[PDB]
Structure formats: C-alpha cells, structure tokens
Assembly symmetry: D2
Homo-oligomer: 250 residues x 4
Amino acid sequence: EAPAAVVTGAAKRIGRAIAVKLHQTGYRVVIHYHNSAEAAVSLADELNKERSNTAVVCQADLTNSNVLPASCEEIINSCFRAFGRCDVLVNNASAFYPTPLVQGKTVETQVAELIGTNAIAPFLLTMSFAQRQSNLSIVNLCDAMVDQPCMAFSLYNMGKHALVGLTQSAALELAPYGIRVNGVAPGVSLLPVAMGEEEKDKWRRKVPLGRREASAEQIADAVIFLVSGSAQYITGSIIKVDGGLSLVHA
Amino acid sequence: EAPAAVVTGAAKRIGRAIAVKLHQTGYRVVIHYHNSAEAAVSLADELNKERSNTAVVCQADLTNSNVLPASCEEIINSCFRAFGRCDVLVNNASAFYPTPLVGKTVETQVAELIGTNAIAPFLLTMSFAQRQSSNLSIVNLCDAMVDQPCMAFSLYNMGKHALVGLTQSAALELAPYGIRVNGVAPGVSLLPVAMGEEEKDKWRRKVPLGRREASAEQIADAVIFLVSGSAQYITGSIIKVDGGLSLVHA
Amino acid sequence: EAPAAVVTGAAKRIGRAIAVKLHQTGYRVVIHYHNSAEAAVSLADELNKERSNTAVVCQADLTNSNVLPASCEEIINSCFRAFGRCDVLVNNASAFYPTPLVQGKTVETQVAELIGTNAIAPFLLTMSFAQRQSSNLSIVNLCDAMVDQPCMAFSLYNMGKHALVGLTQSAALELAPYGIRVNGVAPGVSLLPVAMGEEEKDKWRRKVPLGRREASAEQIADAVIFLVSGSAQYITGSIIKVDGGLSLVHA
Amino acid sequence: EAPAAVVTGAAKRIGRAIAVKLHQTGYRVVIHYHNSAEAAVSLADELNKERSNTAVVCQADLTNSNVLPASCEEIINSCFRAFGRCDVLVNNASAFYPTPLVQKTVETQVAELIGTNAIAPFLLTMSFAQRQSNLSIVNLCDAMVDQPCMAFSLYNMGKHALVGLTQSAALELAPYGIRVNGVAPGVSLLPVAMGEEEKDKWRRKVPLGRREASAEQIADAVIFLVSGSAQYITGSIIKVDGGLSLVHA
Ligand SMILES: NC(=O)c1ccc[n+]([C@@H]2O[C@H](COP(=O)([O-])OP(=O)(O)OC[C@H]3O[C@@H](n4cnc5c(N)ncnc54)[C@H](OP(=O)(O)O)[C@@H]3O)[C@@H](O)[C@H]2O)c1
Ligand SMILES: NC(=O)c1ccc[n+]([C@@H]2O[C@H](COP(=O)([O-])OP(=O)(O)OC[C@H]3O[C@@H](n4cnc5c(N)ncnc54)[C@H](OP(=O)(O)O)[C@@H]3O)[C@@H](O)[C@H]2O)c1
Ligand SMILES: NC(=O)c1ccc[n+]([C@@H]2O[C@H](COP(=O)([O-])OP(=O)(O)OC[C@H]3O[C@@H](n4cnc5c(N)ncnc54)[C@H](OP(=O)(O)O)[C@@H]3O)[C@@H](O)[C@H]2O)c1
Ligand SMILES: NC(=O)c1ccc[n+]([C@@H]2O[C@H](COP(=O)([O-])OP(=O)(O)OC[C@H]3O[C@@H](n4cnc5c(N)ncnc54)[C@H](OP(=O)(O)O)[C@@H]3O)[C@@H](O)[C@H]2O)c1
Ligand SMILES: Nc1nc(N)c2c(-c3ccccc3)c[nH]c2n1
Ligand SMILES: Nc1nc(N)c2c(-c3ccccc3)c[nH]c2n1
Ligand SMILES: Nc1nc(N)c2c(-c3ccccc3)c[nH]c2n1
Ligand SMILES: Nc1nc(N)c2c(-c3ccccc3)c[nH]c2n1
C-alpha cells in the first residue's frame, strides 16, 4: 500500500513543491488549499496523470474560530476517506502580513488568522492526526528568523514561536505512539509574487550561501528527509534551510 | 510624582508579590484579577493604608475572544483613569492545565491558554504603547522550562513560546519609543496549591540550587530589577530565575 | 571521479559508521585514528576489498599543542595525496571524560585533550580544508544535543562541544562565499561507552521518548550523509539533533 | 567584615566599572590586570582613598599555558590573603581580535583567545570553588555569540565555551551555594583604535537609543547578579544589548 500525506496550503509555492516531491517519492497526497482552487486542481490533475487516483484536494480556512477543530478533523478525515490511512502531516499554510503595535482587518481577525494558521490549526491537525492512529510523522514549516523578527510582525512572530513550542511538545507526547514531529525552517525562500525585483535583491544579497533565496524544492528536500527512513530517530528537531541567513548580524 | 504599574493576575501568589514590591518601590498599582475579587480588594486595602490613593483593582477575563482587545484597552485606561499615567506593564496572569493531544471544549482550552499567556499580553502591550525623565517598560512572565515542556501541556507551552516571540518583537518595535520589553522566567516557584507532598517534593528535589522552589518574592526581585534604572539598556532579555532547573538533563 | 572525505576518529563506532556510509554512497575515504590502528586498518581493508584504492588510514593525535596545526594540515594533505581532492570533512574524533571542578591527568592535559579534540582540531582542520581548495564541499561537525543540559562534572568536555557550535556557525558564515557548507549533527544518546555496564545503559535508554533506546551509529550517519548530499545544498550553519526527543525531556 | 570580589582585567573600561561599582556597593576588591599596572594602581589608589585597605591589585597573564593553573590559583589566593574571604569572582578579561580561516602564530591565538575567554575562567572557577553567605560567579559573555563577527571564529569559540562553563559550573556548584551567571554585552565601549565612522556605524545598529552601553550599564547587571535580589538565579546569562541581537541582517 502507498503511504499518504496531508499538505496544508499545497496549491502553490513551497506547499506545492512539498506535495510534488512527496508524490514523486511515492506518497498519495491530500492537497489542502484555502482560496487557490484552480492551482490546487491543476496540481491534482497533473499528479493523477502520473499515477491515477493518487491525489485529492481539500478546501478549508485555517483561521482560528469555534469551527476550526471541526475543520481540522475533516481535513484529516478526508485523507482517510480517500486513501485508508494518514502517514504524514505537513503544516505549511500560513498568513503573513504586518500587525504594527502602534499607529483594513480588525485586530481580533489578525489574531485569528495569524495565530490560527501558524499555530492553532497545526495543533488541531496534530491532535486529529494522532487521534486517528510504520513511519508516521509531522513536519511543521517554521521560520529561521524567529529570534530575529521582522519589524511590526509581532503576531506572525508569535505564531511561529508557538509552532516551535508545538513541534517540541508534540514530539515528546507522541513519541510513545511512534509519531515523530519535526520542523523545516526557511529563511528567505520564494519571495512574494509581486515584490519588486529591487526589493527581492535586498533579501537575496543577505544570504551568505550564494546570495540567493531557497527554491521551494530545496525546502521540500528537507521535508522529504524528515519523513524518510533516514530520519527515524529524529524528533523534535527543527532543520534550518537558510543559506546562513540567521547567522548574519545587523 | 509616583510612576504607575499594571500587574495582571496580581491578586495572589507571584503577581501579588510583584504588585507589593512595585508599591514598596514607589509605584502606584493597578491590581488586575479575574475571579479572585476578595483577595484583590484586600490587597488594594493593604497597600492604600500604607500610602493612600496608590492602588485600584480591575476585573477582566483574559481568555481570547473578539472583545479581548477592548478588555485589554480598558485595563490600561483604568491605570490612566486612576493615576494619570502608566509606566509599567507586567504580564503575569496565566491559565495552566493539561491539554493532551490524545469538560472544557478544545475551542475553550485554546481561548484560555493562548489568550492569557500570549494574546492578552500582546493586546495589552499594544494598548500600553498606544496610550504613551521616563522609564517605561514591560515585563512578561515567561517559563524557564519552555524548551523542556511538561508532558501534555502543548497549548500552555505554545502560549509561553509565543510570549517569548512577543517579548522580542515588541522589544524591537518599541525601542524607538523608549519602551523596554523584557521577561522573567521562573522554573519551579510556588506550587499549585492543589498538589501533594510527594509531588511537591518531587519538584523540589530537581532544583540544583537548594533543592527548593523559588519564593514569589524571588521572582518579583528580577521583575523589579528590569523595571529599575539599573536596566536602562536591557531590552529583549529574558532572565531565568530557576535555581538551575533548566540545566538538568532527564 | 569519486569525491573524497576525511572522517576523524573513524576506526570504530559512529565515525566508522559515517566512513562506511560515505563509502557506500560512492566516496573515497581517509580513516583518521589515534590509538585504534588495528580497527582502522581492518576497516580500510574491508572498504578497499569492496572497491580498490578507495580507503586509506591516517594516524594523528588531536590533543591541543603547538604542532596540532601541522598535524591537522597533514590529515587534509593525506586526502589530497591519496585521492587528489578533499570534498568532505567530518569532525568526529572526541575525547570524553569527567573533569570535576572540586577535588591521573594534569589539568593542562585535560584541557588539551578535551578542548583540543572537540574544538581546536576541528578549527584547524576547517582552516586547512578551506585553505587547500559540479562540486559540493561541506563540513559536518559531530556535536551534542545535550550541550545545554550537560552531564555533571563534565565542564571541559561541554566547553569544547559549545565551542564546536561556535565554530560550526562562524565557519558556516565565513566559508559560504567559497561554496563550503558547515553543519552539525548532534546525537543525544547513541552507542554507549564500551566500558559502561548494561544496567547503566538501560538507565540511559529509558530517558529517550522515541523508543526508549539509543541511536544506532547508522542513524547518526544517515543525517551526516543527508547534510553532505545535494538534498542539503542550501543548508549551512544548521545543527540537526538526532536524539529521539532526549533534549526535550525535563528533569 | 565586608565581602570581597575578584574582577579580572579590571584596570579599564568595563572591568574598571565593574570594580568601582562593586566597591561602591561595599565590596573589597582585587583588581587583576595584565599590562595595565599604572591604571590598576590608580584605581586601587582612588578606591582606597574612599575606604582604607579595601582594594588591592594582582597581576597575571591569562593566556593558556602550563602555568595558567597556578596563576589562577594565585589570583584567587590574593583575595584570601588581602581580605580573608572571596565572595565574588567576575571573569571579565578577554583577548579579542580576528583570526581568519583563510589567508602571531595560530596556536598563540588559540592560547590567548581561548585561554582568556574560557580556560582561565574555568581554572579561576575551580580555584574559587576549591578554596571554600552569597557566593557567586559572573562571566562576561557576548550577546552576539550566535550572530558572530566575520573572521572571529576563535574569539567566538571562546565565548561559546564560556556559555558552556557558565552552565556546567552553575549545575555542578549549586550544591555549594555557589551561583554562576553571565552578563552579555552587545556593543559597549568600542575599541580605542576603531575609526570614528566605524564606531557610529555600530551605534546605529542598536534599537534602543542608537548608542553603545556604558560600562556602568554593564556593571549594573553584574551588581544585580551578585546581590541578594538574585539569590535564586544561577545559570542565567543576561543580555545587555539594547536589542542589538534581535535585529535581522
Ligand atoms: N517563503 C519564505 O520565504 C518563507 C520564509 C520563512 C518561512 N516560510 C514558511 O514556509 C511555509 C511556506 O511558505 P510560502 O511562502 O510558500 O507560504 P505563502 O505562499 O505565504 O502561504 C502558503 C499558503 O498558505 C495558505 N493560507 C494563507 N492563509 C490561510 C488561511 N486563513 N487558511 C488556510 N490557508 C491559508 C494559502 O492558501 P491559498 O493560496 O490556497 O489561499 C497560501 O498559498 C509557511 O509556513 C511560511 O511561513 C516561508
Ligand atoms: N508557579 C511557577 O512555578 C511558575 C513557573 C513558570 C512560570 N510561571 C509563570 O509566572 C506567572 C505567575 O505564576 P503563578 O503560579 O503565580 O500563576 P497562577 O497562580 O497559576 O495564576 C496567576 C493568576 O492568573 C490569573 N488568570 C488565570 N486565568 C485567567 C483568565 N482567563 N483571565 C484573567 N486572569 C486569569 C488568575 O487570576 P484570579 O485568581 O484573579 O482568577 C491567577 O490568580 C505565570 O505567568 C506563570 O506561567 C510560574
Ligand atoms: N556516543 C554517543 O552517545 C554520543 C553522544 C553525543 C555526541 N556524540 C558525538 O559523536 C561523535 C562520535 O561519538 P563516539 O561515541 O563514536 O566517539 P568515541 O568513541 O568516544 O570517540 C571517537 C574517537 O575519538 C578519537 N579520539 C579520542 N581522543 C583522541 C585524540 N586525543 N586524538 C585523536 N583522536 C581521538 C578516538 O580514536 P582512536 O579510537 O583511534 O583512539 C575514538 O575512536 C563524538 O564527537 C561524540 O562526542 C556521541
Ligand atoms: N566592549 C564591548 O562592546 C563588548 C561586547 C561584547 C562582549 N564584551 C565582553 O565584556 C568584557 C569586557 O569588555 P572590554 O571591551 O572592557 O574588554 P577589553 O577592554 O578588550 O579587554 C579587557 C581587559 O582584558 C584583559 N586582557 C586581555 N588579554 C589578556 C591576557 N592575555 N591576560 C590577562 N588579561 C588580559 C586586559 O587587561 P590589561 O589592560 O591589564 O592588559 C584588558 O584590559 C569582555 O569579556 C568582552 O569580551 C564586550
Ligand atoms: N507565509 C509566509 N510567507 C512569506 N512570504 C514569508 C516570508 C518572507 C517574506 C518576504 C521576505 C522574506 C521572507 C517569511 N515568512 C513568510 N511566511
Ligand atoms: N500559570 C502557571 N501556574 C503554574 N503553577 C505554573 C507552573 C508550575 C506548575 C507546577 C510545578 C512547577 C511549575 C509552571 N508554569 C506555570 N504557570
Ligand atoms: N566522544 C564521546 N563519547 C561518548 N560516549 C559520549 C557521550 C555519551 C556518553 C555516555 C552516555 C551518553 C552519551 C556523550 N558525548 C560523548 N562523546
Ligand atoms: N574583549 C573584548 N573587547 C571588545 N572590544 C569586544 C567587542 C567589540 C568590539 C568592537 C565592536 C563591538 C564589540 C566584542 N567583544 C569584545 N571583547
């Protein structure tokens, strides 16, 4: 039987590259997405062409709310209904935007989205994944710059910190069940789509290793490692994939 | 005249020792509480008799919800109303209980643990900064064990990790306004009063320095230092007050 | 043409496991050793019988001294003598024993061996490896997942592993413009000491969340070969724990 | 009687401030120096004029060598000889200069950089503990230890070892009531020979006030850590960096 993996925010960019690579490794994949339906199905169709019936999509908002636990359980359920098992969970979906401390979304909504996507949804997904259960593991997409935060990203940053906490807490608690829990922490990877190249270049020039951002595939390479049998004693570890960015002083 | 401090969860144990010491140092104090009304108004009495018109209490639930931003705003407004100023914010209040991955709802457990330990601090910090020869500073009560978490305390631990992230992000963003943001990280201090001799002594025996818990007063002394004029260049620092506990391997 | 790797303290245990895996992946290897000559020659024999002229040994003391930089330079030279190139350096060799702060070997000697093998030799060897330079050059340093929760009375050993973190980070920063990656692999409990009794090993085993056992030398080698591989081309200055959760467990 | 402290490299700059401030708090002090006799003495003079026979000097090279152990034992002895007790040891002395990985002998650089920043603290720590209230050690660390200066691997290794010793010694010595802590400056007093523009470049990086810390600011955290207000604090390293270590590249 082929193992199966859930990847949140898999329609595009890093999530997509993670789904593709998992599929290429022989996983069946649930491609979860929020708004990006067209990209999600194009990915599913592309993947099913390679091997039939190996890819499904699954839509959900991962913003914090009283329906979030149910949403997260349903995501996990969808992998089971589709494939009869859930071997891997990748928590990749993430809201990201500034939330300045001082002077259109309300602050409670910014909390719900930024803390929901980056932390709470990963927690609920992790409970549901675990409640349902070999080489079982969770990979959380963290942030190598978490202790050198961007100006005015406090809620994003709090969310990523919480994710580190979850990574560790869940690694300890789920180890008796045989479920490993790890993280991949990008520094600068794929820059935002419509960011001017001149601004992209300020970021690239920061990276010691080749003055360039990570490809989504290079991020995905670390995830693959973490799910593989070459990482079977690795739990609670966060691998930075950052080109040395996090080592550079101001 | 006298500066003023807000201390959250100041009705008892460690928050109360912080409120007392701050008062003893010259501060007027807002004593925030949730459910501990009798103990709250009792401390305010004790303090005002010692220096009249230097303490009020302020009730608020710090669970996350859409109205939490207003409740936090009101806590800060309460300090200005009573004292015309707000120089010090101490984020001490905290829910703490297990939330295993495998009769409160999960939605409620997330609301309480993450709201009290993380979201409220962030919102308070925001309202504190928005309202602003001075020495303005914020002290967050963190946790020395945040990287060696209690088994099945994931939401609590996520919260405390987010508080680290807040401590750093807000230290960075508020430096240009002369507001310092730091933390104090206890290990084992006053043990939950619901706990037995064997388990209390189990915790005591782990602590290399004197095989005992920290006094509330020992925690408050580090707080007092960080708000003091001897910490004018300190921001974004978290000081463990843990007797070495965090250094001890399993 | 195959790449070549230097693995220090490679005669047995984790270093041998690293050398063997690098060899199976297609590397030619320099098996450095200090006292364990028989085991080293025996390892190179097996590897050469698998593919001729792919394995050599190279003896050196990695204790700190004024000639230690020449000793480290010769190790790297031996890889270039034997194979014409050096693509990978694994800093594995390590002295490990208690040095109580309150109270055999002189303190001087303790400092030299513990700091020398765990930090100073890795620094000097990193120096020679860089100085002596399709390609994928990296360095992997064998660290310790327990550096921040150290064993009682091991201050000099812990000092050295902390310095090795320092080197991993500093060297990753400084050598990135040359294309050389520098990372680390941090065991918790792996192969227990040969002289430790089974009862005490079981005590160590029972602390590990992931399976209540120590890591196999192979599990450690697996993460080394990941970091040297093309699957880790953007990774530098990262230290991967291979500890089964151990560093996460409170007292 | 009043307690005594040893402060290594106390003749100038951050160590002098640490010594003065300990003295003003009521400590008697040993002012260790290597090259700065004249300054060590001036300081001893100035302190003794305030309070008679409360301040002595002590010379030693803290470079790693076969004699380092005895030198460190002597430094601790001088405090017992001068005042009959030794309550505080501040490891402040430190060599600091670049040691590029690609091109003094390197092993002299190892001896100086590692000896000053890690081995001497370790030996003084041993002699301090051996020769035994509110006893504590305060090590001067570096808030930028994880974001190190380019070409300073050896210095950075030493300060990492110092973190290591801070933690190991706090653990091992807690049984004796001996607390072991660190103070980690970011940019404090800039190097005397650094260019004026170079200095302002570093100042500008600092979030809190775009200035360096004064030695006094550094010493303030030292004094806290030795005070009774830190009697449960061990194994802690307090940054005093104005948020410099938080700022991304
Ligand atoms: N790219 C980088 O440089 C970088 C740096 C550090 C860390 N990381 C981390 O690496 C991971 C992948 O990064 P990325 O740049 O590829 O991410 P991204 O493009 O910013 O976001 C990934 C996906 O997250 C989903 N998402 C956003 N808000 C959501 C919501 N409320 N509910 C459900 N899904 C939501 C989106 O789905 P739809 O498109 O379907 O709406 C989106 O495509 C993230 O966790 C990120 O924080 C990235
Ligand atoms: N005790 C330790 O050993 C230890 C160890 C590590 C960290 N800490 C941290 O140090 C701080 C003090 O610890 P502690 O043991 O004194 O705290 P604690 O007694 O568990 O809690 C202190 C106060 O938090 C308030 N609180 C709880 N839930 C709340 C809510 N929903 N809204 C508003 N307030 C709420 C309570 O107020 P009412 O009584 O008024 O309801 C309570 O008095 C905490 O942040 C804690 O995490 C303590
Ligand atoms: N084993 C574990 O549980 C564990 C845990 C944490 C970290 N690690 C790290 O992983 C690495 C491998 O561990 P291990 O247990 O396999 O190592 P080990 O057996 O303790 O040491 C490996 C080799 O170190 C070499 N060595 C010792 N002193 C030397 C000196 N003065 N000069 C040159 N070489 C010297 C020895 O070579 P000869 O035999 O030829 O004399 C020895 O075979 C080490 O860096 C270790 O600290 C291991
Ligand atoms: N200044 C900063 O911005 C900064 C930043 C981060 C960390 N720190 C740390 O804070 C501490 C104080 O800093 P600083 O700038 O005041 O230091 P510094 O002036 O570079 O050096 C302080 C003293 O250390 C002594 N020293 C140097 N080499 C020695 C040797 N081989 N043997 C014995 N003593 C020796 C010297 O004493 P003599 O003059 O008597 O020869 C020198 O005066 C240091 O540990 C430093 O690493 C400082
Ligand atoms: N979800 C999400 N999307 C992102 N684009 C980022 C980035 C990032 C954004 C711009 C420059 C460097 C990094 C950093 N973290 C991110 N998280
Ligand atoms: N709010 C709150 N209350 C607490 N009692 C704690 C503790 C703690 C609880 C039990 C033993 C040792 C520490 C740790 N963190 C805590 N946070
Ligand atoms: N070189 C070397 N050999 C070792 N055996 C170790 C260990 C280790 C030793 C005993 C129990 C757990 C870990 C930890 N670090 C080590 N380094
Ligand atoms: N002993 C010693 N002296 C120093 N001057 C330093 C510095 C430092 C030197 C220049 C700019 C910023 C920091 C950093 N660490 C230092 N240690």
